[PDB]
Each structure stands twice: as structure tokens, then as C-alpha cells.
Design a protein around this nucleic acid. Structure first.
Lengths: 96, 95, 242, 125, 173
RNA sequence: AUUCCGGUUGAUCCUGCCGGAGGCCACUGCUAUGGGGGUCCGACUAAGCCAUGCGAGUCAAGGGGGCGUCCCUUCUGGGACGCCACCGGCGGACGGCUCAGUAACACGUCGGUAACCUACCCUCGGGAGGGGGAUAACCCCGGGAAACUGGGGCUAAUCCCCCAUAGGCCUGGGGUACUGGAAGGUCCCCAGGCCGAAAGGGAGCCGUAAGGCUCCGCCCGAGGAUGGGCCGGCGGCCGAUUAGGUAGUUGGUGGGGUAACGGCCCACCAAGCCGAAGAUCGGUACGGGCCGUGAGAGCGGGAGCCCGGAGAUGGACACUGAGACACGGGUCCAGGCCCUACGGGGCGCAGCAGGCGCGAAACCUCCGCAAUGCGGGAAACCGCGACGGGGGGACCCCCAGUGCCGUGCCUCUGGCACGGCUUUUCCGGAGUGUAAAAAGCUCCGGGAAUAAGGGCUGGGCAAGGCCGGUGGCAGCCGCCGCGGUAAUACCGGCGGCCCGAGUGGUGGCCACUAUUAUUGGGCCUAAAGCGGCCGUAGCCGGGCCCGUAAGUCCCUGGCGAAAUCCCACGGCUCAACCGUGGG
């Protein structure tokens, strides 16, 4: 799906894990629903700003739902501004 | 370049003769239409102005190239039957 | 979305009785209405081009047909969509060739060479018989052809009988009745292209067709439909049917 | 027009939804009320396939036959009875089942005036 | 209702990573110098299809069954995978190596036309080998027994010259 | 391959689900050297809206004219030769596109129409007699911004009309001549009526003329053939937190209408008809051949190719024709647009390219009628965005490359140095190929030159106890589980393991799952025996004898289109693909 980033937030890893997982709130262009999308990568969060166009994709988890120690998040960002998030974090491309 | 006449048939409804032949040649360029027609006419005693080579087709990794030609009885019949494109390709009409 | 008659025929949908390549192209000639059925017919174009290889293109075949070089049943046929059916005589006088159209053992139509003397005889199975205006009896043959006789000769003809006609003069030569011991040729069905002698005939209630049992030369007995049993002789076939 | 297609209710009392538009071949024509008059009136109708029908709207003469094939052309006066409709007898409309009286007595119609454009009847003994 | 879809002619292993299967396949690849695992799986599925046909025909009765049995045996004998006096039971004894040995590359190497399997493969790819007059450039082609003795250098290829340095090197073996 | 492995505990054995491991389809990150074959490429959301181009024409051998060349006789006018438009005939109802609607005789199969229509085509038996009238084109004059359109005169036909005879239909009375399993059928003889044909037109060759031969033609009757209409038996989804539904409703009598039978409709007579074996109502959906998966039973889908059905912005109507209530014909309403000189006048790509919008999601505003086929023509032949050819695309499948050999060295699953060889592929040329090109195929010249990436590295699962950075933070993690200052688990380097022109991520289906259990699951303690009994439909039912054969089994005819599936042979180099036979 495609959406627009509204704000950047963080969530707490579940017990016994401890850590801050950085996600974004995305409003889908299809019907305007607001969802939470996790940003994979060591420094993926800084590559996403508000009002940015992003593409979100399901997060691999049981029953096609949440994954790992971050329930409540079902989607992850793949492309930001029509550029691959993995490529941006790895450094082969510059954010337009 | 050796031409072997595999088959010859006499079409009487269309006053022509259909010739199927094979050109055997060791490594060499595919024979040209002019050379093929000249050799075929000389060998089979045909009228030069009444023979049209339908095709000379070569195959993958082969030294034998197949060939199909037709020799008519009448120039008028040849013009009436054969399409314009084949005659132009064989160079019977100046275009 | 359908509003009227079809004018086209896809190759994949063509009848199974044709020796045609169903995947080389998309369209096939749609036979015009004519003597025989769709299943037991083939356009003259395929006979001229594919079966005999006298022409390489439909244009050449049409030119040759228009030149009046092909005779079917003794009459020159020019349209390339004319149906050609079983027990038909195809004549090429220019090459002096004569063929009889017959079914194969697998139901496909084939051309069987015949003699020049035999080329003038056409068998016709009396599909139906009725009376028309006046006191005349009309006979309807398997190929849709019609003949007329007088009321006096009413008993000389019956359904399923065979008539040998001299073409193109359209003259009666002989009448082969349908009875025990009559040589017959199967025209369609599982036992197509088989021949033998009549042994027994069975009737059934309602509109169920009659059933006929035929004994072949080797002595085997098989069954088929009376309408499918084509009489082509009395003791020995009068038409070469191998 | 006068559609003569399938009914929209199943025999069980259900409801049927049309899956297609009305077709031309399924259309009928207005009834032909043959009326007794002082002069015959007929019209020609082009029907399905280019065929033709002769429709009789006003009938004056009738062909009456009496038990022996002897037919007579006799003028129609009035319609006595018509079981097809309870009002046709009073409205003087001829129908295939109508009973009329002509110069030579009572007769019963045996043809369909709206389909063949002729009034044929048999004398009543 | 859907139309035909062309299918793959090889089957991948049920589990990508099995120690014994990986070792065996690696040995076969190294021995026969195949480009990748899909060729080996193609030959493996050819063997599997032959075995499945034999198994199905063993427990079948009918004129068509006898015809298919005879055709299978004749086809295998023609390919050269079975002796002339073979029986349907002998089909199940076939091995992957039997099929691998019938490849044009393997036969070219065996006939002494190339020092090594890689050289034979390059010769086949570049068109220095002719089978029954025709030039085949498919290293995976299965040579038929009837034409196994007609394989030789192309009459126009330089290798056909006995004085060629490469030909002398190959003959020096 | 008819299969397992990881996870409840301090440790063990169960039930149970979750996750790995395989195949297929749709999007998508990184990456990319080639060639062939195929039924692939705006179906999922919008059957939403469209600029411009094209997608249906043909006939001079049906007719009268205009223009131009020539031979001319010679003011006249005759004849060839072409071009143009008009009347006239046929076609435009096929093909092409889409899956909205539809739970229905829409579709599949088997039968019926003895209850019905059909131009084109085939066969047989018959006919073509006598008259009459407009008008197109052209000429004069216009009108109207356009789109369109008025008045006057002069003409021909295979144009139209009338008369005549054959022929068609209805009904009444008689004989039984024919096909059928069976005649409201067909045939014959009388009687009353209605309706009611044609083009001896055209062309060529002879013949002084007359006349003749041939080719394409016209009308009627009986049959076919082709395409359909209508009808019947059987078969194929979910919901009872939907139990009652129906009133032309079910049947009858008498009629109307239809091309045809029918409550299809009408006038009267009755109370019928459907339903827990699920009516009615609601949800979803074009049906089938088939496809995906599985060892099979089975489960799931049913867009691309074929057959059948519907639609042409949403509805409703009619005219011409054999065939339409008609995608590129017509009328009205609703909805959205365009031109206007303000009076007025036009349009609807779910046709091929192309554009906007919608979106995660899908291409050129290209060349030819050369092959297949359709319409027209007597024919040559003309037209066809059907089809055929090419262009763009990681659509599917098949075959290959990114070198090889000998010697020597080395930290030897490989790398390096030296000396040789090949040109698959790339680059430049000649032929062949093509409707013309291009691609392919044969050959000549240069040369290892032009060509490897993606994930993973703690187990499940092949691969590191190596070095640097961070020190419950960054982060990873399908599951288990790692990270809090010695991290084999995070980031990076160096090594390695899997596949390889591919390799990863996400959603969906099948197996995994004997967690849907007919094959083949469970219910004392883990999910689950109604608190208990009586009993209606259904299901399951003691022994022997006789009879029928409905189920059942065996044999034999008519069917179940083709493509798709399996086997053998043959043709493209083998293969993919196609053809011939069997299944």
C-alpha cells in the first residue's frame, strides 16, 4: 500500500527484551486509514520525514500479523519517495 | 557447390514444373539466387526467362541447403500465376 | 450478442473429419450449404490445395477452380466453398484422374482412385420418399438430391435402398434393395469404413432408430444403424471400396 | 410492445429477474376484433421471416357449409353467442368459436378471421 | 477454465540443504562437469519419469498396456540405456550415471576427441563435433546408440586437420 | 520421497496449535550476455472519462450521365479506351472488445419439435405474356454560420406499380396413394372464399438478316443444406441470528396473438401450486472444456485459447431487412461534454494505437493485405487495427555463454607466470531470408577480446569459535531466541555455504494437517456424551423357499467438439513447438 507519513513514534520492546523500535504513522491513500509501519535498518528512521510518500508492506509474522517482540505493528516501510529504504540505509543512493 | 535434384513434378493444371533440389557445399557462402538459377537452367535445359526460384533455405549447422523452384511453359502464364513480389525478388521485372 | 448467422469458422472448431492442420492458422473455409452435411463434407478448396497439392495458395486454387478444371459428380464446380461428401466422384479430365470420396477407418474423409468406366456411376441412398403435386413420387437421396418417378413405379423404390445414377445425365441404372445378404458399407460411427453382408434387422419402440447387424468377410458380426448401413451391392460390391 | 416471452414467476411462487433485454422475435400484435359491417376490410401484415398474414377487421360475408360440402356466400347479420368472451356477443365481434345467424339460418364459425382473413362457418341443424 | 501453461522439465529437491544429497550431487557435478544443478535435476527427473512409467506399466493389463510396455523397452534400447535382451524389470535398476553417460559431452570425451570434459564441452558448444553429418551444439544432447559411431570432428573445423596443434595434443593421450 | 524437524518442563511422556521445509499465481528491492517456441502484458480498484488517426466495403458484364485521348464519317454523329460522381444490388446482424448483470432451462449432457422461420448454396419438376409511372445524375434559381435543406424542367434500369395464368392460405364433403413407431402431415376428387410472380435482364462468339452456341441471371413448387427459435429428463455454491412463500398464483374450458406450443395474453370456472429432501428471502458469481496443488482420496481457481450466454454511458422504444428492436444506424428521459454568427446543431473506444483519473499493479498514437479467412464481383481483382510482420516488457518454457589445453610455482574445493588453440557470444562485411525490412541460417577478417549477481553464515539448515565498532543502547528476530564492556546471533572487513541470469521481500491457494478424518480423527482425567427417558421422519435391520429384475455385474450399438494430458515415429540442429497413429 501507499501512504503519507504523519509522524514518527517509538515503541518499547516486549519483556524480557528492552529497546526502542522506531516506527511511523502512515495514512493510506486508498481509504485514508491510519496505520503504524516499522522502519527496518540501523538508521532508517532519520531517512523518513513528515509528509513523505512511502510504500508499506506486510510484516512477516504468524497468521500474517505482528512479528517478533513488537505487536501492534503489522507493516514495514519498503520505499520512501520512490526510493528503496534498504538502499538508502546501506548508502548506495541519496534520498530525493 | 553440387546440386542434386531430389524431386521433379509436372503440374498440368498450372502449366509448370516444380523442382525440389539440394545444394551440397563445404564451408562456403550460401549460393546466390542468380548462380543457383543459372546452374539449374544449364543442367536441366530450361528456359531462362521462365524459371522462378521460390526459395533457397539453409539450416542450422548444415552443408546442404534446400531449394524449391518452378519452371513454367509460358511467360504469360508465369506472369498471370506468380505473385509480383516473387518475380521482383528473382529480378524478372525491373520494378 | 448473437443477432444472425455465422460467416466464419475457426480452425480449432472445424469438423474432425478433415485432414487439416488445426494449429497452423486461425480461420478455415466455412462450407456453403449444399448436398451433404457439415460432418461428412469438406470444401473443394482443401481438396484442390491440401489433399492433392495442385496449388500452393488459396488464390491459385480459386483461379484453377474458376478455370473450370475440376468436375464433381460430372458437373464443373467453380466456387471454392462447395461441399464435397461421401460417395462423390471428383474428376480432373486434364490429368485424366478420378477419385471417390469415402470415409476412413477413423472417420476422416479420403480420396480413393477409381477407374474411368466406374467414374460415371454414383450410388445414392434413398433417404426419404413422398408424394408431390399430381400423382408423382419424389425420392430424396442422402446427399440432398431429388428424383421424380410415376405412381406406377412406387413399389420399385423404398427407404434405405440404393440407386446407381449415371452422372451428369441423371439417369437411373440399377436399384439395389436393402434386405438380408445385401452387401453394405458403413458410412459413419464406430464401425466406419467396414463392409459386409446384412444378417438381421431390429426395430424398437418410439423414435429409436433401427439396428442392423452386418457380417464381414472374415465372419465377424458387428452392429450399426440402419441409416448408417449403405447398400453398395447384392452379393459382391459393385463399387470398389477398399 | 406486446411481449410474449417467459413469465417472471416460477411455479413455486418465486421471482425471476430478467437476464437480457426483450427480443424482437418474442413480440406479439394487437388483437384483431373482427366487426360485422356492410363491407369487408382487410390488411396485409409482414411477419417473421418475410412471410405474410391477412388480417380481417370488418366482415360482411361468410362462407357457410351444410353437411355436404355445398358452400354459400351469405351476408352476416348479427352475432348470437360467443363463448370466448362474455362481451363479444354484445359487441358483435366475430371469433373462431362465435355463433352467428345469416340469411339461411344459424351457423358456427370454424376459421380464424384474424389469421387467414376469411369467415367460414358450418350451418346448425 | 484456463489455457495451457508450459511447465518446467525438472524438479527441485524437496529440501534445499541436506548433507548427503549435497555431497552426492557435488561429486556428480565435479565428475561430469555440468554447468549448474538444473541440468542434473533435469536428468534426474528423466530417470524418475522412466521409472514411474515402468512401475505404472508393471501392474497394468490391456492391449494398450502391452503396446506401451513394448514401446518403452524399445525406446530405452534405442537410447542405449538397456541391452538388447532387456526386460521391463531391468528398467528399475537404471541409475542416474547411466543417463549421464549418454550425454554428447561424455561420449565425446570418451571417444578420445578431447583431453578433458571441459574441452569436450567447448568443442560441442563451438561446433567442432558432427553427429550423423549434422552439427549439434547442445552438450546435453542424448546420443542414440544407432548413431554413436558417427560422431567425429566437423569436416570443416580446423580440428579435422591431423596436423592441428590442438589435435596433436589431444591425440597425445 | 505415501517424510519430518524447532518451540509448554529442573528433567519425561501426551494433547494441541504456531513456525520452518516444497509447488503455483500477483506486486516489488538488487541485478542482467544471447537465441528460439507459446494460446502472456489496464481481469483484481473505475462496465470511469476521452483529443486525434484508423477499425465495412464492393459491383462499369444492372442504368442513364459528365470529363479526357484516339480512329474518324464529317455541323449531325459511330466506335473504342480510361477517370468521376449518381441511381440500383449485395454486405454492413459476421468478425473485434468486455464479464457489469444473471442462482436462471444461463451452462454441460441426452432426447423432442408430429408445435416452428431461414437471404446466400444444392437437386428435381415448371414459367417468364401485356401495359403503365416517377425520380436520382444533369440544368436554372437558391436558403442556411454551420449541420442540413427548398422550388421548377428533362431523362434510364435487374427502380416502382397494375392486369393476366401459374402458385399460397382457410374451411366443408368424399378415396385412401406416401413417409413414419405412431398423422391436426403429404397425395387425389368436388364446393365457398381471400391473397397473388418474374428480369429473356446483361455479356461474349458466329451468322447478310433471320437464327444459333456459351457464360452469368429472374420467379414459383417439393425437398435438402446452413444459422437459429422453443421444450423436456438429469447435473453442478453458502446462510434457518431467513419458516413459511404464491393470487395469473396452479389447473381447466373458449378464444386472441405468435413463425411456432405455452397464462404468453384475454373472458369465465375451480383451489389449486412450492417447502425442513431447505420453499421464499438474502450474500457471492458469467457456465463448461479446463488450470494449480497432492502419492491418491481430495482441496482450491475457473481473465488470456475454444464453445455457449449477456453488454455497448444507465433505462425505455420502434423503422428497413431472411436475420436487429442493431458497438463505428434511429427516437425519448437521466448524466457528462463540444461548436455556435445565440437562431440553432452534435458526441459517448467494454474496437487497434494513444491520453486523463484510479491505483501496489499492465506496452507503439508503427509497416501489409504477401499467407488464413470474410464481404462484393462472372472474373482479374479491391477492402479488412480480423489476421500476418515488426517495437517496448525479468509473462511462461526450451537450448547456450561469461573460454580451453600443456608446463612451472603457490597460503592447492583454487590463484598466479610462460607458450599454444576456439570464436559459442560481441564488432565489421557477402549471400539467403522478408509483402519490403528486421530477426534467424552459410561463409570471410580482428580478437579471450564484450559479458555474474542475489541471499545466507546460532539451531530448524550447508556454511567462522577469526579479527575491529556499540555495551539492555543501537539493532536482529517467520519460531526458538541474541545484545547490560571478552557478542560464533547487531554493524563493518576478511574467509565460507546455497542457487546462478537469477536471487531476495510481501499477499493468496494446495501439501505440511489423520488440525475436517468415506479411505482416515476424537469425546473418564487434556476441546467435547444432551440431567434422564418415550417416540415421529430418516439411517441401519433374524433364518429358509419361490417369482420379477429396479439397484448390481458382463457383452454390444448411438453419444460425451477441438485444443489441453500420456506413449511411439517423423520436421524445425536435439528440445521447447508442430504433424501422423494409439490411449
Amino acid at each position: 500500500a501507499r501512504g503519507i507519513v504523519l509522524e514518527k513514534i517509538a515503541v518499547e520492546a516486549k519483556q524480557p527484551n528492552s529497546g526502542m523500535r522506531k516506527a511511523v504513522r502512515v495514512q493510506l491513500i486508498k481509504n485514508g486509514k491510519v496505520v503504524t509501519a516499522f522502519c527496518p535498518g540501523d538508521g532508517a528512521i532519520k531517512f523518513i520525514d513528515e509528509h513523505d510518500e512511502v510504500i508499506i508492506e506486510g510484516i512477516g509474522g504468524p497468521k500474517g500479523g505482528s512479528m517478533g517482540d513488537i505487536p501492534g505493528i503489522r507493516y514495514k516501510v519498503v520505499k520512501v519517495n520512490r526510493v528503496s529504504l534498504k538502499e538508502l540505509v546501506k548508502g548506495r543512493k541519496e534520498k530525493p | 557447390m553440387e546440386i542434386r535434384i531430389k524431386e521433379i513434378k509436372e503440374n498440368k493444371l498450372i502449366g509448370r514444373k516444380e523442382i525440389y533440389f539440394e545444394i551440397y557445399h563445404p564451408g562456403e557462402p550460401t549460393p546466390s539466387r542468380k548462380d543457383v538459377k543459372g546452374k539449374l537452367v544449364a543442367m536441366l535445359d530450361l528456359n531462362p526467362e521462365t524459371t522462378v526460384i521460390q526459395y533457397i533455405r539453409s539450416y542450422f549447422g548444415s552443408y546442404i541447403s534446400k531449394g524449391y523452384a518452378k519452371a513454367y511453359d509460358s511467360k504469360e502464364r508465369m506472369l498471370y500465376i506468380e505473385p509480383e513480389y516473387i518475380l521482383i525478388r528473382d529480378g524478372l521485372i525491373e520494378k | 450478442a448473437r443477432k444472425g448467422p455465422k460467416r466464419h469458422l475457426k480452425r480449432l472448431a472445424a469438423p474432425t473429419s478433415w485432414y487439416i492442420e488445426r494449429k497452423a492458422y486461425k480461420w478455415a473455409v466455412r462450407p456453403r450449404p449444399g448436398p451433404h452435411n457439415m460432418r461428412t463434407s469438406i470444401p473443394l478448396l482443401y481438396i484442390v490445395r491440401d489433399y492433392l497439392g495442385y496449388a500452393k495458395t488459396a488464390r491459385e486454387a480459386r483461379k484453377i477452380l474458376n478455370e473450370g478444371k475440376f468436375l464433381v459428380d460430372g458437373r464443373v464446380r467453380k466456387d471454392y466453398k462447395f461441399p464435397v461428401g461421401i460417395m462423390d466422384v471428383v474428376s480432373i479430365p486434364e490429368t485424366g484422374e478420378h477419385y471417390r470420396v469415402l470415409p476412413n477407418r477413423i472417420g476422416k474423409l479420403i480420396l480413393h482412385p477409381i477407374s474411368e468406366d466406374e467414374a460415371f456411376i454414383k450410388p445414392l441412398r434413398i433417404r426419404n420418399k413422398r408424394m408431390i403435386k399430381g400423382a408423382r413420387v419424389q425420392l430424396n437421396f442422402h446427399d440432398g438430391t431429388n428424383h421424380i418417378v410415376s405412381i406406377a413405379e412406387k413399389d420399385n423404390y423404398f427407404t434405405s435402398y440404393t440407386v446407381l445414377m449415371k452422372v451428369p445425365e441423371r439417369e437411373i441404372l440399377e436399384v439395389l434393395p436393402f434386405e438380408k445378404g445385401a452387401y453394405v458399407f458403413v458410412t459413419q460411427g464406430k464401425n466406419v469404413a467396414r463392409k459386409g453382408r446384412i444378417v438381421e434387422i431390429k426395430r424398437f419402440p418410439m423414435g429409436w432408430p433401427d439396428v442392423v447387424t452386418i457380417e464381414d468377410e472374415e465372419g465377424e458380426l458387428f452392429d450399426t444403424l440402419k441409416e448408417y448401413a449403405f447398400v453398395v451391392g447384392t452379393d459382391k460390391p459393385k463399387i470398389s471400396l477398399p | 410492445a406486446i411481449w410474449q416471452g417467459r413469465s417472471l414467476k416460477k411455479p413455486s411462487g418465486g421471482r425471476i429477474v430478467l437476464a437480457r433485454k426483450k427480443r424482437k422475435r418474442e413480440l406479439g400484435r394487437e388483437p384483431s376484433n373482427t366487426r360485422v359491417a356492410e363491407q369487408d376490410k382487410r390488411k396485409i401484415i409482414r411477419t417473421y421471416g418475410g412471410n405474410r398474414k391477412v388480417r380481417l377487421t370488418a366482415a360482411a360475408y361468410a362462407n357457410v357449409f351444410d353437411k355436404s360440402g355445398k358452400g354459400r356466400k351469405v351476408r352476416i347479420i348479427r352475432v348470437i353467442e360467443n363463448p370466448a368472451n362474455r362481451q363479444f356477443a354484445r359487441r358483435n365481434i366475430i371469433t373462431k368459436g362465435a355463433i352467428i345467424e345469416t340469411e339461411i339460418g344459424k351457423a358456427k364459425v370454424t376459421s380464424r378471421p384474424g389469421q387467414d382473413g376469411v369467415v367460414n362457418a358450418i350451418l346448425l341443424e | 477454465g484456463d489455457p495451457k501453461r508450459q511447465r518446467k522439465k525438472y524438479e527441485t529437491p524437496p529440501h534445499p540443504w541436506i548433507k548427503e544429497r549435497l555431497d552426492r550431487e557435488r561429486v556428480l557435478m565435479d565428475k561430469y562437469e555440468l554447468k549448474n544443478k538444473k541440468e542434473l535435476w533435469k536428468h534426474e527427473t528423466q530417470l524418475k519419469n522412466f521409472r514411474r512409467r515402468a512401475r505404472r506399466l508393471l501392474a497394468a493389463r490391456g492391449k494398450q498396456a502391452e503396446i506401451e510396455r513394448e514401446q518403452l523397452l524399445a525406446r530405452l534400447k534405442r537410447l542405449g540405456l538397456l541391452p538388447e535382451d532387456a526386460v521391463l524389470d531391468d528398467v528399475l535398476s537404471l541409475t542416474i550415471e547411466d543417463i549421464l553417460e549418454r550425454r554428447l559431452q561424455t561420449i565425446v570425451y570418451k571417444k578420445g576427441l578431447a583431453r578433458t570434459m571441459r574441452q569436450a564441452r567447448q568443442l560441442i558448444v563451438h561446433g567442432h563435433i558432427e553427429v550423423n553429418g549434422q552439427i549439434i551444439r547442445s552438450p546435453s544432447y542424448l546420443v542414440l546408440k544407432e548413431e554413436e559411431d558417427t560422431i567425429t570432428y566437423a569436416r570443416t573445423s580446423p580440428f579435422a586437420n591431423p596436423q592441428h596443434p590442438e589435435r596433436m595434443m589431444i591425440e597425445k593421450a
